[PDB]
Design a protein around this ligand. Sequence first.
Ligand code: ANP
Ligand code: ANP
Ligand code: ANP
Ligand code: MG
Ligand code: MG
Ligand code: MG
Lengths: 484, 483, 53, 469
Amino acid sequence: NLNETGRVLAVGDGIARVFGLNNIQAEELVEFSSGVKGMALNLEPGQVGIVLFGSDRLVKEGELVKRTGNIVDVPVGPGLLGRVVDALGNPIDGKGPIDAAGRSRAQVKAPGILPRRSVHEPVQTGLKAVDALVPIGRGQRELIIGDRQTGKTAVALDTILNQKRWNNGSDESKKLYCVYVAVGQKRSTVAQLVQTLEQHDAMKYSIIVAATASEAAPLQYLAPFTAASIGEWFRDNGKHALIVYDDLSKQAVAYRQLSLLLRRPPGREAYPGDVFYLHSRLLERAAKLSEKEGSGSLTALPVIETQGGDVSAYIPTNVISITDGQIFLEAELFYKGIRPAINVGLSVSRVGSAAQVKALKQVAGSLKLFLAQYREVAAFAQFGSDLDASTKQTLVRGERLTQLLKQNQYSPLATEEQVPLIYAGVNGHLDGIELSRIGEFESSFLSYLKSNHNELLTEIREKGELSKELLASLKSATESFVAT
Amino acid sequence: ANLNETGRVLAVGDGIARVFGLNNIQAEELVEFSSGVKGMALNLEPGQVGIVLFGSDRLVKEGELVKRTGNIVDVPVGPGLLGRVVDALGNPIDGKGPIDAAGRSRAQVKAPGILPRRSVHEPVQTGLKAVDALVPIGRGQRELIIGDRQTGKTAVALDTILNQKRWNNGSDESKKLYCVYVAVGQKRSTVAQLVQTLEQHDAMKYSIIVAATASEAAPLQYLAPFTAASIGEWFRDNGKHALIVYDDLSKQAVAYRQLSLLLRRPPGREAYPGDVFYLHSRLLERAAKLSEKEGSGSLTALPVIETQGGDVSAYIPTNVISITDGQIFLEAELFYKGIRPAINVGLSVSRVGSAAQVKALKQVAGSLKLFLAQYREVAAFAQSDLDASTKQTLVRGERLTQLLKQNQYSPLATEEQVPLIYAGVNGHLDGIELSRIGEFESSFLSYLKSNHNELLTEIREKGELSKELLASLKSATESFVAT
Amino acid sequence: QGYAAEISARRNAMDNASKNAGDMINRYSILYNRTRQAVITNELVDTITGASS
Amino acid sequence: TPITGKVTAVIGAIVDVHFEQSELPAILNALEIKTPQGKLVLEVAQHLGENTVRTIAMDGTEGLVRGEKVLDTGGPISVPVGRETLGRIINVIGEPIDERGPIKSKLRKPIHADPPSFAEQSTSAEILETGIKVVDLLAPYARGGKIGLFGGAGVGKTVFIQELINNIAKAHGGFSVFTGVGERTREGNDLYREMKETGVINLEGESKVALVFGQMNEPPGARARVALTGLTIAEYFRDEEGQDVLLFIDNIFRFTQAGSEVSALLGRIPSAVGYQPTLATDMGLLQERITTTKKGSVTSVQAVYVPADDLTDPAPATTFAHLDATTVLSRGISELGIYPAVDPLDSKSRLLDAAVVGQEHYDVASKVQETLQTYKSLQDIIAILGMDELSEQDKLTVERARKIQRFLSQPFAVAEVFTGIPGKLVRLKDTVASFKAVLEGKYDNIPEHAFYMVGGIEDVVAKAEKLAA
Ligand SMILES: Nc1ncnc2c1ncn2[C@@H]1O[C@H](COP(=O)(O)OP(=O)(O)NP(=O)(O)O)[C@@H](O)[C@H]1O
Ligand SMILES: Nc1ncnc2c1ncn2[C@@H]1O[C@H](COP(=O)(O)OP(=O)(O)NP(=O)(O)O)[C@@H](O)[C@H]1O
Ligand SMILES: Nc1ncnc2c1ncn2[C@@H]1O[C@H](COP(=O)(O)OP(=O)(O)NP(=O)(O)O)[C@@H](O)[C@H]1O
Ligand SMILES: [Mg+2]
Ligand SMILES: [Mg+2]
Ligand SMILES: [Mg+2]
């Protein structure tokens, strides 16, 4: 009876060719006699190609292989909140069992053409540049892309942190549950991150799913998909979850390893022919669901690594064509003092001003285009050229608006804090202030409004819009502060 | 029909014979085919052995007999090879008859480990003004000669082998430096003409030529340097000192990639196989200076690499740069200008030489190295001001530049070098016309040879300068200038 | 006179600009050719790897 | 009463061995072959089926015959651990290669071990002062952290690593392990002598450092493993003796390179640029072991060869994520004579954070980088059109950047033979105050060359006043 069990014919590099198993489903889980788990990907006539989820030091030719009867799944539910698990959802933080409300498979269809509603609800990142220039919606998929060491994680992380403002309220639909996926990162690095999440009282609404550098390639491959299903519980049950795939560059590399060792004839740069589908089906699972489905949402921030600013590389090109917009980080900007190092020219959020707070939309009238006019203007300055009333006036303001968008790490701002500063920037009120003093203008203008004009902020945090009365009230409150 | 000492060819093609049998064969064992051509057992499998041919594929046919040797690829070594020219397998090709060998080392031999070695302290005096003052070579060292094509790479190796005429004539054994020239992928005509020069200068009597020329089976080119290494090693292993020149490794690595591709090894960077670094590293590791306990023998290697359009960033160049203890880089820009040796100062370094360079040169070339790496810098920034202070340094720079031009086949003894450097660094040439510096040299030599011969004698014997002797050259120079 | 002085400076300025601009062109062309050759090799490797199976 | 099999295939470093009956040796197990020299040790890499295993050999396979007798050792390659390794030089297979006889250790642990788990991680942020300006100011190293020195050929990795051994190992108090991977046998020798002559190793007293060598003269099997040997020794000290281990490796690139020489022979379809498909997972299994756990800490310095000066090459590219600080040495800089050839803009640390180094240090570091970046942004305009085409603002930022750049150079003690100047070690606070002052435009009236190859600010003034006369 070689139907439910088989025998290892050959074993190496985390791959096992197994005789028998004549009833096994494709993509079904298997236990080896030695303990180590694995996944059947190749149902060939003579044998079965199986990729292992552990070390192959303990598999031996002839060793028995048992079916599970199960396509790879994971534990899901609110029980995961505040925990750290592996690709298969085994708890790795050493805090005991996972409290599971059920089990989703690893590979799920995306919600189709029908069960959706257009994105319209802000994910507030607390990042002045993102929220103003590339605002992100519930159900949206925004790509964070850049070379190593450019602040890619730092952009996802400030966002996760910033959800503190609603996650401590009783209101559910306002809450945003965070799922962060470490793929190919070293363990000490993931440790250091949860150590931050704890310190900002942010772990309690986060789930960490991590398959790190040392782990078997199929674990790294699988981790984003399982993390997805974990996020989908929230989406499926009328809540909101944000998921961060950090990073898909590394996931594809793993997927290539599987394929090459399984001896699936490779494609471009040795990747599988369907390496685009790998990601495309994953990121299609992030969505805003329809009313008939309880309006829940999953929002994806996948991270991608480039080499030497080559956005034109193979896997970068794929994912850019998958997502709904990109945040582009540049080392050249990082070192000019611009942090987050966001390239405004290249950065977009296709959802646009449909998922941006109306107040912030109002104050950021033409700000993204304005900055384009600024960098066009500052291009002609290099020519050692003296300018006129129109060209000096704009060069001056853009240089200040740039500086205004600089932001420290782990320090996300509230919209009621953001709206004023932008208003002060775009409406001329900063144009005659020394550039080295724009940082000090921030916390001083904030301090000033918190005491004296605290009715102004409450009106913004609760009405989310700007009536002509608020605009006049703000106009005066700023002019007032300009002369201290 | 013995199938243990003997096999039948199954198939032959792409430089590989596939043979059935040879059951008792060793890995890397040499074989002999019906036709007389030889081969190496490279890979042994069930049912067949893959053999790399040391000749044309023509010479092997399916069905033919193949004979064991019971010999891992090896060569005749010893002192009887001095004055001979052999091929990669050690076959005599100068037409001078059977090679008088003391024995037979393997082609692949492991390099001495951490312990049997000692720091370089003895110099290989090239007789080249530029080299010996700036990038000095120690006995046991590996220094790389590298530059574009037609840039005098060979001339630096050659004038080194020539320069040993001085010591290999005397009795003193420890100071004798036997030479091994390895021609790999070069034209036959060139090598023959080169050997002509080595005889013309008598130098042939202490050197050994190993050649795998341009039209020879790739694996014979891949092998050459290694067997040449074996031969060079006999002197190291027995207490003497040998110099080995690999002209050039670039062509060897090319020969090597050929086999690898024909063998179906995955191509990598520039289509070279993954182990092309190992190819070179195992070789140059055999150049060593041995400890007291092992006779104190030294093998010195001068690999030649050919860059393309001066790009030192290429895969193979950086590989060999990362194996050697420095490189003398020869700039095509200087070579065309007339500045020969065309040493680029900034890009050249010896990593171990200083502690082995004769102390006499060391003193008179006070910061000469760091200086010429900076005159060259201020020179390009000169072409905004006719400045005063930097203007005199530029004249110093140009006089030292013109002073380091040297003819081919004209190597000088250390005692001739020291005063020449003294006259430049200490500014005795700054009053002289640019176009007269070459004439100054041999006239300044004439003067030292027929008057102040007593200073010249001293330098040779000491290897130093005393405070007394320093003030002696001071006077000698200044008198000459005004006449 | 200032005019005359400027035209003769602008000339000498452009003369070195052209000299450096032209010297850079040589180093970049050299880089180009490496990168061209490298693109042919790497595409050829993918195609050879693909056929290998 | 053991288990034997016969050699069925030899291809370079790969030996296929067949076993007669019911028990095949586990993957990673060491096997042995009698030679008239000693033993050739093989490691089981995979199971081919039909009772054959494929092994990587640990030494040259010259002379091996089909059908030769192979003996299972019943375990992986083992190495001497514990205090008994200090002052000895060790093989990849845990043999003494210093002619000082047996390394009589009490235990002999396997070189393959699972990396420390997630809960066993111990995250911290203490600055490891190096006394080297660029690092201390711009990319400070972390205690118990991992540190990579990236470099092309002959740009200064090893000298950098020798400087840190010289600067840090001497007075550390904990043990060190130096692993030579695929580098010059000569350099090994050179270092051995240094350890004796500085007293880190005493042949007849106490020793502070263990030595493990697998240089570029050994076969790929030896080079592919030698880092695990050095690593296993370091892990004992960290885990069992609770020590703060210093683990220097030069050069870690060579571990990956070696892996790729056998990869094809193990019958894997090659990945991008000819490398093994297992590149990153092989790197993880080694790299994730070199870590600080709860039981003890491991500060590590690792050289990283960058092939064909290409930083995007899979090998070095993959390594970056594994390091807490990277210092990237750049050929371009080295050819300007600026040593150490650190790229002050492409080197990075975790600890350049206003909380760890304090606001002032951070601020100086930022303004320095800004200034260096402006200059870089202009290199091309400066190159073609020269200094005269710049706005007087930039003219100033460039002139200052050019000083800072030189000020980032430092005579290393170990590089004395190439500078001609005695080495300088500069202290962090003295570094921070010095650059802060150059930023504050208090030294602009001073020539550039005064900033080149000196220590802290007091030597700049010194060189300036000397170069007046
Ligand atoms: N807004 C900011 N201001 C100042 N520093 C920052 C900011 N954001 C991030 N950084 C720092 O920049 C460095 C790199 O940011 P990080 O978020 O690690 O980018 P990354 O893309 O994850 N790098 P890697 O993961 O190695 O590819 C870290 O030292 C951060 O602390
Ligand atoms: N110091 C010198 N002065 C003048 N001519 C020289 C000098 N040295 C070498 N040459 C000549 O310049 C030519 C090229 O130099 P050569 O020594 O062949 O360098 P190479 O780099 O080996 N060239 P190739 O082997 O063809 O790539 C030869 O004809 C030499 O004889
Ligand atoms: N701190 C320094 N100061 C001055 N020169 C240096 C310094 N470090 C390295 N160099 C120069 O660079 C040469 C080689 O440096 P080295 O430390 O061997 O770099 P490497 O990258 O380890 N060598 P390789 O293994 O060939 O890549 C030395 O011989 C010096 O000429
Ligand atoms: Mg990151
Ligand atoms: Mg030549
Ligand atoms: Mg080195």
